[PDB]
């Protein structure tokens, strides 16, 4: 019932479940935290910005890797108007045989890609599932830099 | 071990084990005292 809202002693003394709920919803309101100065505020915001950019780059790297690994980017290059892009494969134990058959695309059940990443990456000059892997590797390196 | 075994190795791992340990840690942390 203590020590969770480390940034707020008023919440940490709450004997109810409201402390847990308000601890989540006030975690990023740095200006309202206990023992707070402006320098610490700007420094924490700066570090949070770095972590956020790292998260964005990791998300993009994950999209690239999953298109390279479980997608049909190379097949889509040769026939972009008939082949439907694949986002990533599906492994869900709750599937029946009918669901597996219906979601089956090429070798495994997979989700069609509605993000338009296939067309975007094709336009900027990507033609191989090894070009996407290089992008994922580089973006994970950039995320490490930002962290 | 082929690459197609990775989903069956990772999806249960992440989607069940990570919730369990994360719940353990979060409950322990939010139920601490001083």
């Amino acid at each position: 019932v203590y020590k969770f809202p480390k940034f707020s002693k008023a919440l940490a003394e709450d004997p109810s479940t409201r402390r847990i709920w308000y601890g989540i919803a006030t975690a990023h309101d740095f200006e309202s935290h206990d023992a707070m100065t402006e320098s610490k505020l700007y420094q924490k915001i700066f570090a949070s910005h770095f972590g956020h950019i790292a998260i964005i780059f990791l998300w993009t790297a994950g999209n690239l890797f999953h298109v390279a690994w479980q997608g049909n980017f190379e097949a889509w290059i040769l026939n972009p108007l008939k082949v439907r892009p694949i986002a990533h494969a599906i492994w869900d134990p709750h599937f029946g045989q009918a669901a597996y058959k219906a979601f089956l695309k090429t070798s495994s059940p997979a989700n069609l890609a509605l993000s338009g990443v296939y067309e975007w990456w094709y336009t900027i000059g990507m033609r191989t599932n090894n070009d996407l892997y290089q992008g994922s590797f580089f973006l994970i390196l950039l995320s490490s830099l930002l962290l | 071990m082929s690459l197609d075994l990775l989903p069956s190795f990772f999806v249960p791992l992440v989607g069940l084990v990570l919730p369990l340990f994360s719940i353990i840690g979060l409950f322990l942390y939010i139920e601490k005292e001083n």
Partner: peptide
């Protein structure tokens, strides 16, 4: 089709990015 080595080293590099993330997470304090 990417190889096992390609996926494995990407997983290893992802682990390194994870240790860098907790270091940033712990440095942003409890």
């Amino acid at each position: 089709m990417i190889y096992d080595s390609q996926v494995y080293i990407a997983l290893v590099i992802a682990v390194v990015a994870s240790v860098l993330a907790i270091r940033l997470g712990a440095t942003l304090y409890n």
